[PDB]
Design a protein that fits this description.
The structure is cut from a larger assembly and holds one copy of chain A (128 residues) and two copies of chain B.
Chain A (H helix, E strand, L loop, with lengths): L17 H6 L12 H25 L9 E5 L19 H7 L3 H15 L3 H4 L3
Chain B lengths: L2 E13 L5 E3 L28 E2 L5 E2 L6 H18 L12 E5 L12 E5 L2 E2 L6 E2 L2 E5 L3 E3 L4 E4 L6 E4 L12 E3 L4 E5 L10 E2 L3 E3 L13 E2 L10 E3 L10 E4 L6 E5 L2 E8 L5 E9 L5 E5 L1 H18 L5 E4 L7 H4 L1 E4 L4 E4 L14 E7 L2 E2 L7 E4 L7 E5 L3 E6 L3 E6 L5 H8 L2 E14 L3
Parallel strand pairs in B: 12-29, 24-32
Antiparallel strand pairs in B: 1-33, 2-13, 3-16, 4-15, 5-6, 5-11, 6-9, 7-8, 10-11, 14-16, 14-33, 17-31, 18-19, 19-31, 20-23, 20-30, 21-22, 23-27, 25-26, 26-27, 28-29, 31-32
Classes of the chains: A mainly alpha (128), B mainly beta (440).
Bound molecules: a molecule of 5 linked components (NAG-NAG-BMA-MAN-MAN), a molecule of 2 linked components (NAG-NAG) (7 copies) and 2-acetamido-2-deoxy-beta-D-glucopyranose (7 copies).
A molecule of 2 linked components (NAG-NAG) binds next to loops of chain B.
PDB class: viral protein/immune system
Keywords: HIV-1, HIV Envelope, sosip, antibody, viral protein, VIRAL PROTEIN-IMMUNE SYSTEM complex
Entry title: BG505 MD64 N332-GT2 SOSIP trimer in complex with germline-reverted BG18 fragment antigen binding
Chain lengths: 128, 440, 43
């Protein structure tokens, strides 16, 4: 398809397109200062941290490197328990995402606590 | 039974504001060194128009809340201000002018229009002055009560010489978004202005935009594709203006048919300005032509689009514009060194029920761009004659029982660019996702 | 004609101020303070 090619597609169908989504991220050396040089300087900066802040988060979430990895925290079924075998390959990413959106903050702090706090101690506990 | 599974690279976005930058089509200019639009020090466009279609997905836009308008309208003022800075300030120009008419025996419309004038201009030495004969226009001088005349600016603003090597030709500008972002595209024909475009697609970098300045009409712009398309925000309000896009252009010819002469006088140690010295031949009005029968056929398409959702059993009356400044009254445009003011009363004298044409045109010298009281640019005169040929694309109207008055409006330059940015919006890519699956 | 501490404090003054035209000047009456002006030796 292409970059954002599987946008309105099945989540399982759009599972196998992640590489094209990640390649199409991040020129002219010797900038001046005048007008457009400001924006190109601003273009260089905003590409960095917006690449990087989530790249911090995968190290926070222990899922370092490109992996579709899964955690050890259970799914709370209070978060719209809707046929999670069926709906997982039915709708889209997109419309499903705003359904999740009211609780994503609650998830993330539990993610950095579940295996990232606990299961990152215990290999030192067996390191003897 | 289910555990949270993370996902990276999910195709999902939100809507956000971001900084956004130039993209030029790389040419070999090397003549005017740099124009007003800094095409130099801009990144060359990738000649690969990667335009990726989006299947079976919709998104409601709004052409009335594009922050891309407010970013660009900031930049056009600022680039204009940036290039205008390092040139000659005509501070000692604001003097008492002894003047008289230039062609005193003349019957035409140009009678009492060009004015011969006289100075005491400060030379490059401190204690040497100089009597200078020059020519000016009616729309540049003001009486004081060979009566004493005075320029307009000295009421309000100061004067900058307009750097007589640069140009003003509107280069097509592309807008590349930074990484981690995308630009949506509507692509739906007959798009309302605010609605879910079904046929969406996206690019990194938009198509060409010519930042032309124009009042009352939309010169040189982009065509439509199907028919006359009407857009506005609140069609029932009298405060919202009217955006019209046409499926076909009208070839307008415009000319300043005078063989002229430009002189030069050093007024400071390096300050040497150019002024409208003399006219060879004899004095001729500047005007513009238009195919009348084409334009009536063009305007006949318009009223059909009008009577669809407004005023079916109601006459449609066009009137001349009301009044105010010349920029909000008459057609005004630059055409490469000259600032025309063409009267358009001969295009809005018409009603409806159920062999060319000539517009007289005035020109100025001292320009107050974007209504900024405090800044005033003095354009230099141009030798030779002017032979501007242009299309037309759009029309800006306003609405004033079973009678309807449409007067031609304008004023805000930002409305020029909503005619070019309705096809786009800015999204922030989110490469995250968390779903429950069967693994622990 | 003032007896208080403010005696000889505010000073009426006169100018020839350049107007917006190059060859037009203007006589201007204004007020100033002791701590702004210096004598030169209606002085
Ligand atoms: C809408 O689009 C149309 C495109 O179809 C635009 O029409 C074009 O407009 C340009 C500029 O107005 C015009 O170019 C001129 O062509 C002449 C014939 O080839 C050239 O001789 C002339 O070049 C001179 O002027 C330029 C600007 O000053 C200089 O860059 C150039 O070096 C030349 O300058 C020398 O000569 C002059 C003569 O007086 C002298 O004073 C200078 O000092 C210097 O010595 C122009 O480039 C195109 O021909 C037009 N095309 C058509 C088909 O008409 C139209 O302008 C657009 N509408 C609007 C409103 O912009
Ligand atoms: C503007 O008016 C002045 C009036 O003095 C013109 O100057 C005189 O013009 C005649 C013929 O044109 C000459 O014979 C004189 O020598 C000029 N006087 C001076 C002092 O030079 C001037 O020509 C007019 N401007 C134009 C462009 O015609
Ligand atoms: C085109 O835009 C206009 C507004 O400029 C829409 O008009 C209103 O739309 C809302 C929501 O769709 C309705 O609740 C109103 O009843 C509409 N008013 C009128 C007078 O029509 C219009 O629906 C849009 N049309 C399309 C096809 O999107
Ligand atoms: C002005 O409009 C004319 C049409 O009236 C344009 O000419 C067409 O341009 C397209 C794109 O290059 C060509 O495919 C057509 O063949 C042209 N038609 C004719 C009759 O020449 C012209 O490009 C427009 N110019 C501007 C500056 O907008
Ligand atoms: C569009 O403008 C019209 C005015 O022409 C608005 O209609 C009136 O608005 C006032 C103030 O909100 C109300 O008191 C009237 O009752 C309205 N009249 C009608 C017939 O509704 C209208 O609200 C505006 N709509 C939008 C979306 O801006
Ligand atoms: C504007 O002027 C140009 C030339 O000055 C006109 O172009 C000519 O048009 C006629 C008929 O349309 C053709 O037969 C000629 O071959 C054209 N000549 C050139 C050099 O292009 C153009 O038609 C004028 N436009 C209007 C509306 O009058
Ligand atoms: C454009 O030309 C028309 C030519 O008629 C001007 O209209 C005249 O304006 C004067 C001044 O108000 C009136 O006294 C006349 O009655 C008008 N004529 C008609 C037929 O109505 C018009 O003023 C010009 N445009 C501008 C901006 O001055
Ligand atoms: C400053 O002193 C001058 C002295 O001339 C005052 O000017 C005169 O003031 C009287 C009465 O105040 C007027 O009748 C005269 O007409 C003024 N003369 C002129 C030339 O205007 C001036 O008033 C004093 N300043 C203040 C603030 O009182
Ligand atoms: C799931 O979320 C609800 C709130 O929506 C909360 O009351 C409940 O305790 C959560 N379940 C678990 C197992 O944490
Ligand atoms: C120029 O100066 C001379 C003498 O200073 C004066 O007679 C003449 O009126 C002045 N002309 C203008 C246009 O200022
Ligand atoms: C100065 O500006 C005022 C309004 O701001 C206007 O009425 C007046 O005519 C102007 N004077 C000149 C000489 O342009
Ligand atoms: C203008 O006058 C000059 C005088 O030498 C002549 O060479 C030139 O051809 C004229 N141009 C026009 C357009 O008449
Ligand atoms: C324009 O055309 C319409 C019909 O096509 C006609 O009724 C009208 O009189 C025409 N106007 C002019 C000025 O020719
Ligand atoms: C409109 O045109 C007619 C003739 O075509 C003329 O008699 C009338 O005065 C014009 N009115 C206006 C407002 O231009
Ligand atoms: C102002 O100028 C006039 C004449 O040039 C002179 O008589 C007067 O003393 C001057 N006053 C001041 C305050 O400079």
């Amino acid at each position: 398809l292409g970059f954002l090619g599987a946008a309105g597609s099945t989540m399982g169908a759009a599972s196998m397109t992640l590489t094209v989504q990640a390649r199409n991220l991040l020129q002219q050396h010797l900038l001046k200062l005048t007008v457009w040089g400001i924006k190109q300087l601003q273009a260089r900066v905003l590409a960095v941290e917006h690449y990087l802040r989530d790249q911090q988060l995968l190290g926070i979430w222990g899922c370092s490197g490109k992996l579709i990895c899964c955690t050890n925290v259970p799914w709370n079924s209070s978060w719209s328990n809707r046929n999670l075998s069926e709906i997982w390959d039915n709708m889209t990413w997109l419309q499903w995402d705003k359904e999740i959106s009211n609780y994503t903050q609650i998830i993330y702090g539990l993610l950095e606590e579940s295996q990232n706090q606990q299961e990152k101690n215990e290999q030192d506990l067996l390191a003897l | 039974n289910l555990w949270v599974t993370v996902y990276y690279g999910v195709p999902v976005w939100k809507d956000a504001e971001t900084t956004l930058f130039c993209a030029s089509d790389a040419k070999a200019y090397e003549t005017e060194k740099h124009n007003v639009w800094a095409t130099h020090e801009c990144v060359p466009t990738d000649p690969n128009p990667q335009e990726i279609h989006l299947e079976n997905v919709t998104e409601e836009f709004n052409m009335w809340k594009n922050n891309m308008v407010e970013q660009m309208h900031t930049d056009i003022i600022e680039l204009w201000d940036q290039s205008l800075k390092p040139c000659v300030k005509l501070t000692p120009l604001c003097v008492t002018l002894q003047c008289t008419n230039y062609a005193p025996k003349l019957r035409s419309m140009m009678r009492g229009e060009i004015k011969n004038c006289s100075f005491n201009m400060t030379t490059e030495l401190r204690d040497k002055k100089q009597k200078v004969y020059s020519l000016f226009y009616r729309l540049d001088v003001v009486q004081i009560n060979n009566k004493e005349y005075r320029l307009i600016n000295c009421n309000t603003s100061a004067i900058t010489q307009a750097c007589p090597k640069v140009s003003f030709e509107p280069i097509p500008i592309h807008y590349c978004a930074p990484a981690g972002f995308a630009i949506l595209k509507c692509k739906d024909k007959k798009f309302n202005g605010t609605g879910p475009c079904p046929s969406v697609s996206t690019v990194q970098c938009t198509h060409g935009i010519k930042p032309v300045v124009s009042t009352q009409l939309l010169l040189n712009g982009s065509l439509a594709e199907e028919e006359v398309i009407i857009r506005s925000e609140n069609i029932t309000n009298n405060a919202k203006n009217i955006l019209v896009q046409l499926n076909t252009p009208v070839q307008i010819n415009c000319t300043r048919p005078n063989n002229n002469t430009v002189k030069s006088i050093r007024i400071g140690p390096g300050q040497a300005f150019y002024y409208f010295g003399d006219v060879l031949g004899d004095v001729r009005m500047a005007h513009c032509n238009i195919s009348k029968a084409t334009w009536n056929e063009t305007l006949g398409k318009v009223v059909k689009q009008l009577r669809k959702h407004f005023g079916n059993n109601t006459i449609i009356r066009f009137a001349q514009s009301s009044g105010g400044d010349l920029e909000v009254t008459t057609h005004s445009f630059n055409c490469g060194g000259e600032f025309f003011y063409c009267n358009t009363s001969g295009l809005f004298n018409s009603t409806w029920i159920s062999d060319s044409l000539i517009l007289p045109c005035r020109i100025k010298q001292i320009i107050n761009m974007w209504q900024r009281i405090g800044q005033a640019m003095y354009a230099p005169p141009i030798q030779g004659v002017i032979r501007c040929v242009s299309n037309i694309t759009g029309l800006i109207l306003t609405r004033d029982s079973t009678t309807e008055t449409f007067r031609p409006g304008g004023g805000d330059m930002r409305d020029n660019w909503r005619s070019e940015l309705y096809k786009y919006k800015v999204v922030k890519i989110e490469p995250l996702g968390v779903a429950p699956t069967r693994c622990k």
